[PDB]
Short mmCIF file of C-alpha atoms in Angstrom, two decimals:
data_model
loop_
_atom_site.label_atom_id
_atom_site.label_comp_id
_atom_site.label_asym_id
_atom_site.label_seq_id
_atom_site.Cartn_x
_atom_site.Cartn_y
_atom_site.Cartn_z
CA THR A 1 92.62 105.37 102.01
CA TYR A 2 96.34 105.91 103.10
CA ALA A 3 98.89 103.36 104.69
CA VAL A 4 102.59 103.77 105.44
CA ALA A 5 105.34 101.39 106.66
CA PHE A 6 108.97 101.71 107.67
CA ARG A 7 112.09 99.40 107.52
CA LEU A 8 114.65 100.18 110.22
CA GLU A 9 117.61 98.61 112.07
CA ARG A 10 115.44 97.85 115.21
CA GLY A 11 112.61 96.25 112.97
CA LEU A 12 109.59 97.20 110.98
CA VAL A 13 106.53 99.47 111.84
CA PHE A 14 103.10 99.51 109.96
CA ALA A 15 100.26 101.87 109.80
CA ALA A 16 96.83 102.35 107.98
CA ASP A 17 93.63 104.25 108.25
CA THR A 18 90.27 102.66 108.35
CA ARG A 19 88.12 104.98 106.06
CA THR A 20 87.13 103.48 102.68
CA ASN A 21 85.00 104.25 99.45
CA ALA A 22 83.09 100.91 99.81
CA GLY A 23 79.67 101.87 98.48
CA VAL A 24 78.76 103.94 95.40
CA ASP A 25 77.63 106.91 97.67
CA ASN A 26 78.31 105.77 101.33
CA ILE A 27 81.66 105.30 103.06
CA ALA A 28 82.51 102.75 105.77
CA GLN A 29 85.06 101.67 108.35
CA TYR A 30 87.25 98.67 107.46
CA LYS A 31 90.59 97.36 108.95
CA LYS A 32 93.36 97.03 106.26
CA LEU A 33 96.36 96.07 108.41
CA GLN A 34 96.02 92.32 108.16
CA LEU A 35 98.23 89.91 110.27
CA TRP A 36 99.52 86.36 110.16
CA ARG A 37 101.83 84.76 112.77
CA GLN A 38 103.32 81.36 113.85
CA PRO A 39 104.98 82.49 117.28
CA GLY A 40 108.76 81.46 117.18
CA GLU A 41 109.09 80.90 113.37
CA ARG A 42 107.57 83.89 111.47
CA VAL A 43 105.47 87.07 111.17
CA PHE A 44 103.69 88.79 108.43
CA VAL A 45 101.89 92.13 108.15
CA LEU A 46 99.95 93.26 105.02
CA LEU A 47 98.75 96.71 104.49
CA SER A 48 96.22 97.13 101.73
CA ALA A 49 94.77 99.94 99.49
CA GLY A 50 92.60 100.59 96.40
CA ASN A 51 89.43 98.75 95.51
CA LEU A 52 87.93 97.10 98.68
CA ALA A 53 86.37 94.09 96.74
CA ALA A 54 89.67 93.36 95.08
CA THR A 55 91.55 93.96 98.42
CA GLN A 56 89.31 91.36 100.33
CA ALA A 57 89.59 88.97 97.52
CA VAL A 58 93.34 88.83 97.76
CA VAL A 59 93.05 88.46 101.64
CA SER A 60 90.39 85.90 101.35
CA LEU A 61 92.47 83.75 98.77
CA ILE A 62 95.55 83.93 101.00
CA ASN A 63 93.51 82.66 103.92
CA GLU A 64 91.85 80.00 101.63
CA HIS A 65 95.17 78.53 100.45
CA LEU A 66 96.43 78.12 104.00
CA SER A 67 93.29 76.43 105.43
CA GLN A 68 92.48 74.15 102.38
CA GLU A 69 94.89 71.37 102.61
CA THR A 70 97.63 70.16 105.13
CA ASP A 71 99.39 68.50 102.04
CA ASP A 72 101.54 71.01 100.38
CA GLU A 73 99.97 71.71 96.95
CA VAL A 74 101.48 75.24 96.41
CA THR A 75 103.78 77.63 98.27
CA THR A 76 101.79 79.49 100.98
CA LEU A 77 102.91 82.19 103.60
CA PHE A 78 103.72 79.50 106.18
CA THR A 79 105.46 77.12 103.67
CA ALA A 80 107.66 79.59 101.81
CA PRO A 81 111.40 79.58 102.47
CA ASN A 82 112.27 83.32 102.65
CA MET A 83 110.56 86.86 102.45
CA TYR A 84 111.20 87.32 98.78
CA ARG A 85 109.30 84.11 98.13
CA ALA A 86 106.72 85.02 100.78
CA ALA A 87 106.13 88.26 98.63
CA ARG A 88 105.65 86.02 95.60
CA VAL A 89 102.69 84.30 97.42
CA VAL A 90 101.01 87.67 97.88
CA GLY A 91 102.06 88.66 94.22
CA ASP A 92 100.44 85.33 92.69
CA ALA A 93 97.31 85.96 95.03
CA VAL A 94 96.88 89.34 93.23
CA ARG A 95 97.17 87.59 89.82
CA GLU A 96 94.76 84.88 90.96
CA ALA A 97 92.13 87.40 91.97
CA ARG A 98 92.43 89.15 88.64
CA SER A 99 92.19 85.88 86.71
CA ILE A 100 88.99 84.84 88.71
CA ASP A 101 87.28 88.28 88.15
CA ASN A 102 94.09 99.15 91.08
CA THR A 103 95.19 97.26 94.40
CA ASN A 104 98.47 98.37 95.95
CA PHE A 105 99.73 96.54 99.00
CA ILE A 106 102.65 96.85 101.57
CA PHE A 107 103.67 93.30 102.54
CA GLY A 108 106.25 93.07 105.19
CA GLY A 109 107.55 90.94 108.28
CA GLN A 110 110.28 88.46 109.25
CA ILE A 111 111.13 84.64 108.71
CA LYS A 112 113.73 83.02 110.92
CA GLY A 113 117.23 82.75 109.34
CA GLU A 114 117.04 86.30 107.67
CA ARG A 115 116.47 89.95 108.73
CA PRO A 116 113.08 91.77 108.52
CA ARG A 117 112.29 92.69 104.99
CA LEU A 118 109.61 95.21 103.61
CA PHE A 119 108.00 95.07 100.13
CA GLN A 120 105.36 96.88 98.09
CA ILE A 121 103.13 94.88 95.72
CA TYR A 122 101.71 96.50 92.47
CA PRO A 123 98.36 95.60 90.67
CA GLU A 124 100.11 93.68 87.96
CA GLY A 125 101.81 91.12 90.43
CA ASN A 126 105.48 92.23 90.64
CA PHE A 127 106.87 94.00 93.56
CA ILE A 128 109.92 96.09 95.03
CA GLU A 129 111.99 95.77 98.21
CA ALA A 130 112.85 98.66 100.64
CA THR A 131 116.49 99.75 101.17
CA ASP A 132 118.30 102.02 103.62
CA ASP A 133 118.17 104.80 101.03
CA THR A 134 114.35 104.87 100.91
CA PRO A 135 113.36 103.14 104.13
CA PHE A 136 109.54 103.39 103.57
CA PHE A 137 106.57 102.75 101.34
CA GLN A 138 103.19 104.47 100.81
CA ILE A 139 99.78 103.31 99.28
CA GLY A 140 96.59 105.21 98.60
CA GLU A 141 96.52 108.88 99.10
CA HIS A 142 100.20 109.16 99.68
CA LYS A 143 101.03 112.77 98.27
CA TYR A 144 99.74 114.86 101.24
CA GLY A 145 101.98 112.92 103.78
CA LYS A 146 105.08 112.58 101.83
CA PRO A 147 106.60 115.92 102.35
CA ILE A 148 107.45 115.23 106.05
CA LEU A 149 108.59 111.71 105.38
CA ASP A 150 111.26 112.88 102.76
CA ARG A 151 112.62 115.52 105.25
CA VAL A 152 113.09 113.59 108.54
CA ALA A 153 113.00 109.68 107.70
CA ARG A 154 116.13 107.65 108.28
CA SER A 155 116.95 103.78 108.44
CA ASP A 156 118.77 104.43 111.72
CA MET A 157 115.51 105.54 113.50
CA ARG A 158 114.12 103.98 116.53
CA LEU A 159 110.87 102.08 116.33
CA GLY A 160 108.94 104.69 118.52
CA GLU A 161 110.59 107.66 116.60
CA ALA A 162 109.35 106.40 113.36
CA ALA A 163 105.77 106.01 114.85
CA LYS A 164 105.76 109.84 115.45
CA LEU A 165 106.79 110.42 111.70
CA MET A 166 104.18 107.97 110.34
CA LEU A 167 101.40 109.50 112.49
CA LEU A 168 102.46 113.00 111.59
CA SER A 169 102.08 111.91 107.95
CA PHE A 170 98.42 111.10 108.72
CA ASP A 171 98.00 114.49 110.40
CA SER A 172 98.78 116.34 107.21
CA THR A 173 96.56 113.81 105.21
CA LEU A 174 93.57 113.99 107.58
CA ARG A 175 92.92 117.72 107.41
CA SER A 176 93.20 118.17 103.59
CA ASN A 177 91.60 114.98 102.14
CA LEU A 178 88.45 113.49 103.54
CA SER A 179 89.06 109.99 101.79
CA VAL A 180 91.42 109.30 104.59
CA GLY A 181 89.89 109.00 108.11
CA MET A 182 90.53 107.71 111.62
CA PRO A 183 90.81 105.32 113.38
CA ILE A 184 94.24 104.12 112.44
CA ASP A 185 95.59 100.78 113.14
CA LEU A 186 99.36 100.95 113.99
CA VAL A 187 101.66 97.89 114.63
CA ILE A 188 105.33 98.04 115.65
CA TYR A 189 107.54 94.91 115.33
CA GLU A 190 110.95 94.40 117.07
CA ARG A 191 113.78 92.52 115.31
CA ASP A 192 114.31 88.80 115.98
CA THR A 193 111.08 88.64 118.22
CA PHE A 194 108.79 86.82 115.96
CA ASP A 195 105.69 87.98 117.88
CA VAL A 196 103.19 91.01 117.46
CA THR A 197 102.51 92.20 120.98
CA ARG A 198 103.08 95.85 120.21
CA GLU A 199 99.78 97.01 118.58
CA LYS A 200 97.13 99.68 119.03
CA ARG A 201 94.16 101.27 117.32
CA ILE A 202 94.41 105.02 117.50
CA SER A 203 90.84 106.60 117.46
CA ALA A 204 89.71 110.26 117.07
CA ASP A 205 89.15 110.37 120.87
CA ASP A 206 92.68 109.29 121.58
CA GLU A 207 94.66 111.94 123.55
CA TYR A 208 98.22 111.31 122.40
CA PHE A 209 97.30 112.03 118.68
CA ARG A 210 95.33 115.09 120.03
CA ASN A 211 98.57 116.32 121.69
CA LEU A 212 100.64 115.15 118.73
CA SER A 213 98.59 117.39 116.29
CA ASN A 214 98.32 120.38 118.47
CA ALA A 215 102.04 120.43 119.50
CA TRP A 216 102.96 120.06 115.77
CA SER A 217 100.42 122.73 114.68
CA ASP A 218 101.71 125.17 117.49
CA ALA A 219 105.29 124.49 116.09
CA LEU A 220 104.48 125.22 112.50
CA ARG A 221 102.30 128.25 113.52
CA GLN A 222 105.21 129.52 115.60
CA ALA A 223 107.86 128.79 112.97
CA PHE A 224 105.69 130.43 110.18
CA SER A 225 105.19 133.65 112.15
CA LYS A 226 108.89 134.05 112.50
CA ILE A 227 109.50 133.85 108.59
CA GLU A 228 110.63 137.17 107.33
CA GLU A 229 108.83 138.87 104.34
CA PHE A 230 110.77 142.10 103.76
CA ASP A 231 112.96 140.41 101.01
CA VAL A 232 110.58 139.88 98.01
CA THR B 1 103.48 121.92 86.90
CA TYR B 2 102.09 123.67 89.99
CA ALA B 3 100.46 127.01 90.64
CA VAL B 4 98.63 128.83 93.55
CA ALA B 5 96.90 132.11 94.11
CA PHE B 6 95.45 133.95 97.16
CA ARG B 7 92.49 136.29 97.38
CA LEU B 8 92.84 138.67 100.37
CA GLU B 9 91.54 142.00 101.61
CA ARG B 10 94.59 144.06 100.62
CA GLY B 11 94.60 142.30 97.12
CA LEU B 12 95.75 139.31 95.24
CA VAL B 13 98.87 137.22 95.01
CA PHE B 14 99.78 134.94 92.18
CA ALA B 15 102.61 132.11 91.76
CA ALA B 16 103.49 129.38 89.37
CA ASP B 17 106.42 127.24 88.58
CA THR B 18 108.15 126.98 85.11
CA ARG B 19 108.86 123.21 84.71
CA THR B 20 106.71 121.49 81.95
CA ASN B 21 107.04 118.63 79.55
CA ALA B 22 106.94 119.29 75.78
CA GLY B 23 107.14 115.51 74.67
CA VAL B 24 107.10 112.24 76.57
CA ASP B 25 110.99 112.57 77.11
CA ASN B 26 111.70 116.29 76.89
CA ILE B 27 111.22 118.66 79.71
CA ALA B 28 111.79 122.50 79.81
CA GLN B 29 111.01 125.95 81.19
CA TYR B 30 107.81 127.65 80.14
CA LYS B 31 106.40 130.68 82.08
CA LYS B 32 102.73 129.83 83.20
CA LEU B 33 101.98 133.37 84.64
CA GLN B 34 100.46 135.66 81.92
CA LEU B 35 99.09 139.09 82.45
CA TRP B 36 97.19 141.98 80.51
CA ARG B 37 97.21 145.70 81.53
CA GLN B 38 95.58 148.83 80.99
CA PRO B 39 97.10 151.04 83.63
CA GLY B 40 94.33 152.82 85.56
CA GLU B 41 91.34 150.93 84.29
CA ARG B 42 91.97 147.23 84.72
CA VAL B 43 94.39 144.33 85.43
CA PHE B 44 94.32 140.61 84.71
CA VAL B 45 96.48 137.52 85.71
CA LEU B 46 96.16 133.94 84.30
CA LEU B 47 97.94 131.00 85.80
CA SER B 48 97.72 127.95 83.56
CA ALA B 49 98.18 124.27 84.38
CA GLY B 50 97.67 120.97 82.25
CA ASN B 51 98.78 120.42 78.63
CA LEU B 52 101.03 123.12 77.29
CA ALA B 53 99.65 122.92 73.60
CA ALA B 54 96.15 123.42 74.94
CA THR B 55 97.21 126.03 77.50
CA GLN B 56 99.04 128.22 74.78
CA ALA B 57 95.91 127.81 72.44
CA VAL B 58 93.80 129.51 75.04
CA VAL B 59 96.47 132.23 75.56
CA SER B 60 96.82 132.73 71.89
CA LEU B 61 92.96 132.96 71.27
CA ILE B 62 92.70 135.69 74.00
CA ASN B 63 95.59 137.75 72.62
CA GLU B 64 94.17 137.13 69.10
CA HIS B 65 90.65 138.56 70.04
CA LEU B 66 92.40 141.55 71.59
CA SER B 67 94.45 142.15 68.45
CA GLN B 68 91.24 142.08 66.15
CA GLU B 69 89.20 145.37 67.11
CA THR B 70 87.48 145.14 63.71
CA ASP B 71 83.68 145.00 63.54
CA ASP B 72 83.47 142.62 66.51
CA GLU B 73 80.52 142.08 68.76
CA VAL B 74 82.42 139.46 70.78
CA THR B 75 83.34 140.29 74.42
CA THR B 76 87.13 140.45 75.10
CA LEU B 77 89.03 141.05 78.34
CA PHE B 78 89.39 144.81 77.82
CA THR B 79 85.62 145.21 76.75
CA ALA B 80 84.03 143.20 79.69
CA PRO B 81 82.09 145.22 82.25
CA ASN B 82 82.98 143.27 85.39
CA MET B 83 85.38 140.47 86.51
CA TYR B 84 82.70 137.63 86.38
CA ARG B 85 82.26 138.47 82.66
CA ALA B 86 85.92 138.76 82.19
CA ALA B 87 86.30 135.23 83.73
CA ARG B 88 83.63 133.85 81.37
CA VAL B 89 85.70 135.46 78.52
CA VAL B 90 88.58 133.20 79.44
CA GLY B 91 86.09 130.30 79.77
CA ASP B 92 84.78 130.97 76.14
CA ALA B 93 88.46 130.80 74.85
CA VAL B 94 88.72 127.35 76.43
CA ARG B 95 85.48 126.25 74.68
CA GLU B 96 86.88 127.84 71.49
CA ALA B 97 90.16 125.82 71.91
CA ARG B 98 88.24 122.52 72.28
CA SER B 99 86.24 123.29 69.01
CA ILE B 100 89.31 124.27 66.83
CA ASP B 101 91.67 121.54 67.94
CA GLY B 102 94.53 114.32 76.03
CA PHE B 103 92.81 117.73 76.76
CA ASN B 104 92.96 118.74 80.46
CA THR B 105 93.34 122.50 80.68
CA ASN B 106 93.12 124.01 84.03
CA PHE B 107 93.51 127.73 85.06
CA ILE B 108 93.46 130.21 87.95
CA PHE B 109 92.19 133.57 86.50
CA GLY B 110 92.14 136.53 88.58
CA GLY B 111 92.58 140.50 88.75
CA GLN B 112 90.42 143.71 89.08
CA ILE B 113 88.43 146.00 86.88
CA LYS B 114 87.57 149.54 88.21
CA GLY B 115 84.09 149.65 89.77
CA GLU B 116 84.32 146.54 92.00
CA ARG B 117 86.78 144.75 94.33
CA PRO B 118 89.43 142.23 93.26
CA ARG B 119 88.14 138.88 92.29
CA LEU B 120 89.82 135.38 91.84
CA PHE B 121 88.45 132.39 89.85
CA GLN B 122 89.62 128.83 88.87
CA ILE B 123 88.64 127.86 85.13
CA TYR B 124 87.85 124.11 84.48
CA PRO B 125 88.52 121.97 81.29
CA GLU B 126 84.83 122.16 80.07
CA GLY B 127 84.57 125.97 80.29
CA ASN B 128 82.84 126.72 83.59
CA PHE B 129 84.43 128.16 86.75
CA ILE B 130 84.35 128.91 90.42
CA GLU B 131 84.98 132.07 92.42
CA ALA B 132 87.27 132.39 95.58
CA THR B 133 85.42 133.30 98.84
CA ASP B 134 86.67 134.26 102.48
CA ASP B 135 86.13 130.57 103.57
CA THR B 136 88.53 129.16 100.81
CA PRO B 137 90.69 132.11 99.93
CA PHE B 138 93.05 130.23 97.49
CA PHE B 139 93.08 127.92 94.54
CA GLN B 140 95.55 125.38 93.26
CA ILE B 141 96.23 123.77 89.87
CA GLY B 142 98.59 121.04 88.79
CA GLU B 143 100.58 119.09 91.66
CA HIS B 144 98.45 120.58 94.43
CA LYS B 145 98.64 117.68 96.66
CA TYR B 146 102.13 117.97 98.19
CA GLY B 147 101.84 121.57 99.28
CA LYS B 148 98.14 121.54 100.44
CA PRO B 149 98.67 120.61 104.03
CA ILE B 150 100.69 123.71 104.89
CA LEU B 151 98.24 126.04 103.06
CA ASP B 152 95.27 124.38 105.16
CA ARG B 153 97.20 124.89 108.32
CA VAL B 154 97.81 128.84 108.24
CA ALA B 155 95.58 130.23 105.37
CA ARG B 156 93.32 133.02 106.26
CA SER B 157 91.36 135.54 104.13
CA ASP B 158 92.74 138.53 106.24
CA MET B 159 96.53 137.68 105.69
CA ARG B 160 99.06 140.26 104.52
CA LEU B 161 100.19 140.05 100.79
CA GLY B 162 103.64 139.21 102.01
CA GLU B 163 102.36 136.70 104.51
CA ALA B 164 100.42 134.92 101.69
CA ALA B 165 103.46 135.02 99.54
CA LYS B 166 105.87 133.39 102.06
CA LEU B 167 103.19 130.77 102.62
CA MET B 168 102.81 130.04 99.03
CA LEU B 169 106.53 129.73 98.58
CA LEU B 170 106.59 127.10 101.49
CA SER B 171 103.73 125.25 99.51
CA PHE B 172 106.36 125.16 96.58
CA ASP B 173 109.23 124.12 99.08
CA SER B 174 107.12 120.95 100.11
CA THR B 175 106.27 120.35 96.50
CA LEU B 176 109.75 120.70 94.91
CA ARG B 177 111.52 118.41 97.38
CA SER B 178 108.93 115.59 96.96
CA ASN B 179 108.18 115.87 93.18
CA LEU B 180 110.38 116.52 90.16
CA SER B 181 107.63 117.46 87.64
CA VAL B 182 107.19 120.74 89.68
CA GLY B 183 110.59 122.70 89.34
CA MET B 184 112.15 126.15 89.69
CA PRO B 185 112.21 129.01 88.57
CA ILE B 186 108.99 130.44 90.16
CA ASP B 187 107.13 133.40 88.80
CA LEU B 188 105.61 135.55 91.79
CA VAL B 189 103.20 138.49 91.07
CA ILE B 190 101.56 140.56 93.99
CA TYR B 191 98.72 142.91 93.04
CA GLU B 192 97.55 145.53 95.66
CA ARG B 193 93.86 146.47 95.86
CA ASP B 194 92.70 149.40 93.72
CA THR B 195 96.26 150.17 92.27
CA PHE B 196 95.29 148.93 88.76
CA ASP B 197 99.01 147.97 87.77
CA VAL B 198 101.22 144.90 88.04
CA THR B 199 104.23 146.84 89.59
CA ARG B 200 105.39 144.00 91.88
CA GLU B 201 106.61 141.10 89.82
CA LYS B 202 109.66 138.87 90.46
CA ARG B 203 111.06 135.54 89.21
CA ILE B 204 112.65 133.39 91.97
CA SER B 205 115.50 131.58 90.33
CA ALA B 206 117.05 128.20 91.41
CA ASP B 207 120.00 130.06 92.87
CA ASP B 208 117.93 132.63 94.81
CA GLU B 209 119.31 133.80 98.31
CA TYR B 210 115.72 134.42 99.91
CA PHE B 211 114.29 130.98 98.91
CA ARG B 212 117.39 128.90 99.89
CA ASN B 213 117.35 130.86 103.38
CA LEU B 214 113.66 130.30 103.57
CA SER B 215 113.90 126.56 102.79
CA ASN B 216 116.82 125.76 105.18
CA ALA B 217 115.23 127.76 107.97
CA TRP B 218 112.00 125.93 107.41
CA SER B 219 113.82 122.58 107.28
CA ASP B 220 115.50 123.30 110.73
CA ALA B 221 112.33 124.37 112.22
CA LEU B 222 110.63 121.09 111.26
CA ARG B 223 113.59 118.99 112.52
CA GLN B 224 113.62 121.07 115.68
CA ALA B 225 109.97 120.65 116.21
CA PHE B 226 110.17 117.05 115.64
CA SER B 227 112.82 116.26 118.37
CA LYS B 228 110.29 117.80 120.92
CA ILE B 229 107.43 115.39 120.04
CA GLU B 230 106.43 112.80 122.65
CA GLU B 231 107.49 109.23 122.05
CA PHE B 232 104.88 106.72 120.83
CA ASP B 233 105.04 103.42 122.74
CA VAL B 234 102.51 100.60 123.00
#
């Protein structure tokens, strides 16, 4: 399990792998990048990590509260005024699941009236917003991929440029840890569009990611061979 | 807390940071690399991660048993026939630490005794251990996660001792930037095969010229390599 998302000037980008520790012994493929949309008004993307039962409980409880009543009983994703209050709908859904009987999320999107805003939800219920200083979040097996993010990330990056960095974060994680595994569900979002046309599943057979990994490997192999060792 | 060691054809390489935590609030420098010597006969090196009180308890018990030499049938580091037995002597000291009195000791013990080749091990909290092979020529303890990718990319069993040392310092470079628990200085030790003495030993300080040149050169190489990557667009 590993997911990453960026907050930029041009908009938001999201990414998450599919491999999970579902069974006690077995491992299975499950899509973690959830999506909600009302074209014109608003867009939401929810990346998820941790326990799959508790993850799917929060996703199911969000979809239940939307579809149950036309009459406004409580604040839902579509009925919330701004993204801070939209994050609270996800936060209360985590509290609801724990009440009913280690889930970390990355909730992000945009509502008309304000800019795109990215958040990270903790297991307790509370959350934090992304800023230009630290323009991304991670959940699940984050430590393998963080080194390259800390070096080259920037809030002024382009949307496709951040997708290189985010996918290179997976490339480090995939070789080391076997908990993370392809395919990867990536979703780019442009500012003030309110529509999720830009989306792709990147499988193991994919040739862009093959060229990405080999070109990056060659660069690190070439750069490492030039490093002097006579001074130690 | 982070340490790493390589087993190669030409010998062994050991490296470990100094930054630990004494209490919940306090943090300070403590050297993790310990070594015992009997020039000509045998050499040992012990990297030590986890709890400091438990770490020092194992190091103290090993030094204590060495200091006895009085009517003893127990096996020490200097009295053990081969390195597997020498590794289990360190394992017995971990078991003795648990008995005497949370607990999460984790070591990388390696070296050579005359008669056989250099052998590298990783000691676990409970007492048992595993040996390094040609397939997996290194071990890690403490904050291993950040520096593991660069090791997995270019680590080989047939590398040079200096080639491993520069790779291990790049593993630190990735960890140091992305985590504050791991911190400089770093203590490097290179052991050559069948030399039976730790001649090559160096502390890499925070203001070291080689490491800052290594880090900035590597940082530029990664940024230059990133700009030549193809644009994702869909």
